[PDB]
Amino acid sequence: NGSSLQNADKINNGNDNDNDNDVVPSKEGSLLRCSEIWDRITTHPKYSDIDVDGLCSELMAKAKCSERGVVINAEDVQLALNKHMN
Amino acid sequence: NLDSNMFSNDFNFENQFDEQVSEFCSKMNQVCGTR
């Protein structure tokens, strides 16, 4: 049902080099604060060999000062908590 | 009647209260300092 050797690709070629237009995001990631993660730490009966010091210099400079206290995307604490799991 | 909100209460642990948001959180907001 095809030559199979059909060497080709999609004629899209749509590069669209748009800059980081970060505005009203909508991906998976709840809004949590400092000790707020302390709750995340508990919600996982896993635990094994994590470093609480790395989360300090990782969540402290990703912090976003707001009147709702400091707020960070669970995508930074999930990548900071999953990159230190040996 | 729950019990949240109220801070912890166990100075017998060592000396200061255990709390749950001090130098850790109190400095995570500090970043709000204008450079």
Side-chain angles (χ1 to χ4, degrees), chain A residues 20-29 64 73:
Chain A
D20 183 280
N21 301 127
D22 180 40
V23 279
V24 191
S26 174
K27 49 174 174 191
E28 197 292 280
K64 302 167 55 162
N73 302 235

Side-chain angles (χ1 to χ4, degrees), chain A residues 61-75:
Chain A
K62 259 61 165 184
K64 302 167 55 162
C65 171
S66 304
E67 306 288 305
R68 296 178 56 165
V70 56
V71 294
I72 295 168
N73 302 235
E75 195 175 74

Side-chain angles (χ1 to χ4, degrees), chain B residues 1-9 20:
Chain B
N1 185 312
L2 316 183
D3 297 88
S4 299
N5 200 135
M6 304 179 173
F7 308 90
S8 176
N9 296 93
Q20 29 166 307

Side-chain angles (χ1 to χ4, degrees), chain A residues 67-84:
Chain A
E67 306 288 305
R68 296 178 56 165
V70 56
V71 294
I72 295 168
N73 302 235
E75 195 175 74
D76 173 50
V77 320
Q78 188 284 307
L79 290 173
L81 290 165
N82 186 236
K83 76 193 294 196
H84 294 318

Side-chain angles (χ1 to χ4, degrees), chain A residues 10-73:
Chain A
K10 57 188 183 303
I11 50 171
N12 184 244
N13 189 18
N15 298 280
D16 309 281
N17 55 183
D18 299 324
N19 299 338
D20 183 280
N21 301 127
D22 180 40
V23 279
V24 191
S26 174
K27 49 174 174 191
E28 197 292 280
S30 294
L31 176 140
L32 356 76
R33 312 95 182 165
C34 49
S35 168
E36 205 69 75
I37 262 69
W38 193 256
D39 297 323
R40 179 55 35 164
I41 309 309
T42 62
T43 55
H44 67 85
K46 181 164 186 182
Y47 231 129
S48 44
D49 302 293
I50 301 167
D51 55 345
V52 302
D53 57 74
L55 326 183
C56 186
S57 183
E58 193 158 8
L59 277 70
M60 183 279 208
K62 259 61 165 184
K64 302 167 55 162
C65 171
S66 304
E67 306 288 305
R68 296 178 56 165
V70 56
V71 294
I72 295 168
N73 302 235

Side-chain angles (χ1 to χ4, degrees), chain B residues 1-34:
Chain B
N1 185 312
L2 316 183
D3 297 88
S4 299
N5 200 135
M6 304 179 173
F7 308 90
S8 176
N9 296 93
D10 297 274
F11 56 91
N12 183 241
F13 187 89
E14 184 175 291
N15 183 297
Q16 302 293 331
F17 291 96
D18 300 326
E19 306 298 302
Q20 29 166 307
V21 280
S22 196
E23 56 189 25
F24 188 92
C25 192
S26 308
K27 187 184 184 179
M28 288 264 285
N29 300 253
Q30 170 164 288
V31 183
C32 204
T34 307

